[PDB]
Design a protein that fits this description.
This is part of a larger assembly, with two copies of chain A, two copies of chain B, two copies of chain C and two copies of chain D.
Chain A: H1 8-17, H2 26-39, H3 48-74, H4 82-91
Chain C: H1 9-18, H2 26-53, E1 58-59, H3 61-71, H4 75-93
Helix pairs in contact in C: 2-3, 3-4
Chain D: H1 7-17, H2 26-51, H3 59-69, E1 72-74
Helix pairs in contact in D: 2-3
The chains are: A mainly alpha (about 100), B mainly alpha (about 110), C mainly alpha (about 100), D mainly alpha (about 80).
Chain B binds a DNA duplex (91 and 92 nucleotides) through helix 2.
PDB class: dna binding protein/dna
Keywords: Nucleosome, Telomere, Chromatin, DNA binding protein, DNA BINDING PROTEIN-DNA complex
Entry title: Telomeric Dinucleosome in open state
Chain lengths: ~100, ~110, ~100, ~80, ~100, ~90, ~100, ~80
DNA sequence: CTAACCCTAACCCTAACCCTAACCCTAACCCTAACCCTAACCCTAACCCTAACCCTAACCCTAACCCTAACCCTAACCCTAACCCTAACCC
DNA sequence: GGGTTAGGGTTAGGGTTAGGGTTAGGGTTAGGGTTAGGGTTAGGGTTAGGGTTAGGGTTAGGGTTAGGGTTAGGGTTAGGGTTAGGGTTAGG
């Protein structure tokens, strides 16, 4: 029995000290193949490409979450909002 | 060999052949590849020294991508030279912000009815 | 069976020269090889751009020195320039 | 397949990124952003594979597309 | 007949692009249809840019092409804004798109 | 003195072809020349990269077509590809 | 006699509809020469380079002001603060 | 020796720049922060131009070297030069 | 099924753009004596055109001695309840 | 400055599950087998590329004088903070 807003730092440190992968393998491969089937069908993937794309997406999501957390901290708010991710995507230059 | 004459260990003929095959210029010099090899040797020596320092600080005798990522993010010059560089299986820095903290106890346990 | 570059023996020799009590892995070796290849490609591109801007056909050590001074910040740039000039003088004095 | 990214996955990603509190529509917004990025990357890889007269996307074409987009990746491939 | 402009149905020079590609040391062998393709792409891009500039000049009640009209035509088109993102035009201008909050209320 | 490129006569001819009632200035001509030079440099760099990646020595129309399809977004890419294929067929038939 | 927070839009529209230069010439040239004298002395400038640098600085300042105004609007504040320009410089990536 | 050139950017200049950029309200330290940012950017650009001029075996910085430095930094400029 | 966020409804002042009239610096020119950029060979030494047989560099040979994750066990690195300057602000 | 009074971290003691050590077979690399394929020179003239004079048509670089900012200043009201629990709404 603990109080809220205290045990989150332990999980944050545990996830930051580890360099393992969080996203799965079969659902990500299925989503990648479903997206690739929209352009040209009969496409294959040598696994390594899917892992590289997953690592790139993980790095991009980590950077976006860091920018959103910094913007929320500057805006005097521990929580995040869709307007925060909109401001992040607008200031970073990627679209809009 | 050029390694015993220039006092270096990186190959010079390999860089010269790569520059001649890459079609970068009409004539590639002979001292320019030596200069590039010396610069690459100094950069590799600095990177290996940072990796060894990180491994010794982390109580490890080997070079892992985590140590390289830590040495890259710690040095300000290496962070500016390699800005938008993503290293697979590297990691991030656990630099918690000043606001993201448990802070203090307001009213014992935030209870005004006690 | 083909043949690849794989800059590994020279990196291992440099590591043993600066610290013979430590080693390296395959992932770190691949990261170092990719970094060296990217640095070499950037230097070659900068040298080609300088040669095309100066209306010249040959490439000397001054072009690569300027490319290093422009890519590298300050202290690292001055250290690399000094080490390159020392290596050039050593190669010129000893044929 | 778009709903494959579960809620605990985004929660762990936000905890690793330093986020201490998540709303509700953040999951859907991150899902859409990831879908758009994956679509662009897959389109670039398909164009590269079609230029290389091949079908299966390899790691070299992925590295080339990542370098063209502006985000290099080390370790994977060569 | 004597020039490539009368055979390919274009107006941009092909031999100039071929000589520039041969002198730039981009590849060992530069083709002959590749410069024609590049000239056609450049001609289409120039035609689209000139059409946008003429439309902007006609909307601004002007009979000439000024950098302001080019900047307006670039910032108005979404495709031209994505193709030329970080492009600064001297003596161009900015868009007077006032925000919803910046109002006298 | 010397001799400069200055892509101006062809731009003026294209402008008179699409709209003979309008003109152009020196600053707009310089901006158009810089844009054309930047596009040509980007196309040449993309073609050189594709030739170095495909382990080839020659350059065909397929490399420049792919470079245009990668640089240009969608509608402009498809229009430029169609116009280039039409010009190639016209140059090959005649 | 007018009320505050109303006549600013007129000046904003007047400055946006015009494509003229706001920064002077002699003070900018003096500052550029004073900065260039720190690295290497006996330097000259053909005016056109100073005008190009001034135009680039004007475009950069306009973009930075636009980003700061957008961030302040998102933060529910019409005014700007040094923390806003710090957040802008941190998110944009420039140092 | 040249001095007092950092304070050349007057207050009305930054006010007009903010009005053109869409800023409807300016604080106090914004002027000093913009002055420092402009000084840093000018220092970097001048250093790059000096390096380019030294590589070109020249002294006076021309417009071509300025365009080259702007393209190397990552911000192209059209109209000025060629 | 728990307590700290959390967002707008009570109320604050110190920061904060609009402002006309003493203002006295800079911008179209002006030669002018000091000077860096470009054209004809001179000639000269370093690198392309390509042998020689070399001394050195890539897969594997079976072990080699200090690299994995995890197999019993000690004990203290963050959890929470009193506590002492320190700058903050309104007399 | 000083009227006291909201507000900043904080470390004695309690807390038990979170770090400390730990540990055993094969998992993970490094000095050993060989030969052929690039790394590296050793004989021949040459063509892109350095040294040096002057002259030449500039062009950065000495200065006038008069008016639009220039700041000269203030208000006062307007857009900035300062918070009550209210359900409440996301957190383990």
């Amino acid at each position: 029995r603990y109080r809220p807003g205290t045990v989150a730092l332990r999980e944050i440190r545990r996830y930051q000290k580890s360099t393992e992968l969080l996203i799965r393998k079969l659902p990500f491969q299925r989503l990648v193949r479903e997206i690739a089937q929209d352009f040209k069908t009969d496409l294959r993937f040598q696994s390594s490409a899917v892992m590289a794309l997953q690592e790139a997406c993980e790095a991009y999501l980590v950077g976006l979450f860091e920018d959103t957390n910094l913007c929320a901290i500057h805006a005097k708010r521990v929580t995040i909002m869709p307007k925060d991710i909109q401001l992040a995507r607008r200031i970073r230059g990627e679209r809009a | 060999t050029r390694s015993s004459r220039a006092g270096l260990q990186f190959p010079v003929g390999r860089v010269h052949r790569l520059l001649r095959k890459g079609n970068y210029s009409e004539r590639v010099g002979a001292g320019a590849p030596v200069y590039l090899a010396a610069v690459l040797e100094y950069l590799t020596a600095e990177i290996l020294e940072l990796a060894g320092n990180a491994a010794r600080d982390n109580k490890k005798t080997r070079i892992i991508p985590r140590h390289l990522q830590l040495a890259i993010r710690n040095d300000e010059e290496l962070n500016k030279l390699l800005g938008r560089v993503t290293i697979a299986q590297g990691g991030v820095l656990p630099n918690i912000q000043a606001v993201l903290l448990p802070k203090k106890t307001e009213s014992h346990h935030k209870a005004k009815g006690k | 069976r083909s043949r690849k570059e794989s800059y590994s023996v020279y990196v291992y020799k440099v590591l043993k020269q600066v610290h013979p009590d430590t080693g390296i892995s395959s992932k770190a070796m691949g990261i170092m090889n990719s970094f060296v290849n990217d640095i070499f490609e950037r230097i070659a591109g900068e040298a080609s751009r300088l040669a095309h801007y100066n209306k010249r056909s040959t490439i000397t050590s001054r072009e690569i020195q300027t490319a290093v001074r422009l890519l590298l910040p300050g202290e690292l740039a001055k250290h690399a320039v000094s080490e390159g000039t020392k290596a050039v003088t050593k190669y010129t004095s000893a044929k | 397949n778009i709903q494959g990214i579960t809620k605990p996955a985004i929660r762990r990603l936000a905890r690793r990124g330093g986020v201490k509190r998540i709303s509700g529509l953040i999951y859907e917004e991150t899902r859409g952003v990831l879908k758009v990025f994956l679509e662009n990357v897959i389109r670039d890889a398909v164009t590269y594979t079609e230029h290389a007269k091949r079908k299966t996307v390899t790691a070299m074409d992925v590295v080339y597309a990542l370098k063209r987009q502006g985000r290099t990746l080390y370790g994977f491939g060569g």
